[PDB]
From a paper:
Cytoplasmic poly(A)-binding protein (PABP), also termed PABPC or PABPC1, is an essential protein that binds to and mediates the stimulatory effect of the poly(A) tail on translation initiation. Previous studies showed that MLLE is a peptide-binding domain that specifically recognizes a conserved PAM2 (for PABP-interacting motif 2) sequence. Unlike other PAM2-containing proteins, eRF3 possesses two overlapping PAM2 sequences (PAM2-N and PAM2-C), which each independently bind to the MLLE domain of PABPC1 with low micromolar affinity. Here, we determined two crystal structures of the MLLE domain of human PABPC1 in complex with the PAM2-N and PAM2-C peptides from human eRF3.
We obtained well-diffracting co-crystals with eRF3 residues 67–81 (PAM2-N) and 76–90 (PAM2-C). The C-terminal site (PAM2-C), in particular, lacks a leucine recognition element that is found in essentially all other PAM2 peptides. Overlay of the MLLE/PAM2-N and MLLE/PAM2-C structures reveals striking similarity of the bound conformations despite the highly divergent peptide sequences. The peptides adopt an extended conformation interrupted by a β-turn at residues Asn70-Val71-Asn72 in PAM2-N and at residues Asn79-Val80-His81 in PAM2-C. The most significant differences between the two peptide complexes occur at the N-terminus where PAM2-C lacks a highly conserved leucine residue. In its place, Phe76 bends back to partly occupy the space vacated by the missing leucine side chain. Thus eRF3 Phe76 plays two distinct roles in the complexes, alternately occupying the hydrophobic pocket between MLLE helices α2 and α3 in the PAM2-N complex and between helices α3 and α5 in the PAM2-C complex. Glutamic acid is preferred at position 9 and makes hydrogen bonds with amides of Gly579 and Lys580 in the PAM2-C structure via ordered water molecules. The simultaneous requirement for Phe76 for MLLE binding by both PAM2-N and PAM2-C explains the previous observations of a one-to-one stoichiometry of eRF3 binding to PABPC1 despite the existence of two PAM2 motifs.
Author numbering:
A (entry chain B): 76 to 90
B (entry chain A): 544 to 620
Write the structure that this text describes.
Amino acid sequence: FVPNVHAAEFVPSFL
Amino acid sequence: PLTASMLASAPPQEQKQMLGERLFPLIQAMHPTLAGKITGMLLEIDNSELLHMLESPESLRSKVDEAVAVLQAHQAK
């Protein structure tokens, strides 16, 4: 696994 | 618990979100501010491995530690 610093942030929005 | 069967039967466009919802609180426990970014980075891993990470705390921590080491180095430079 090579981490991708460009990855989209996971926004918590589950309710 | 989220199972492989549940994931495989979900529309592909919901699969990452389903995994993310279960991984996020665990990653947030480890890293309360970087959690969103680290979760996003981990979600690029394939779904089989993500499900394994959900079931194996040592596996999740190893991936989180690698993402954090890389992210923090990136932030610093």
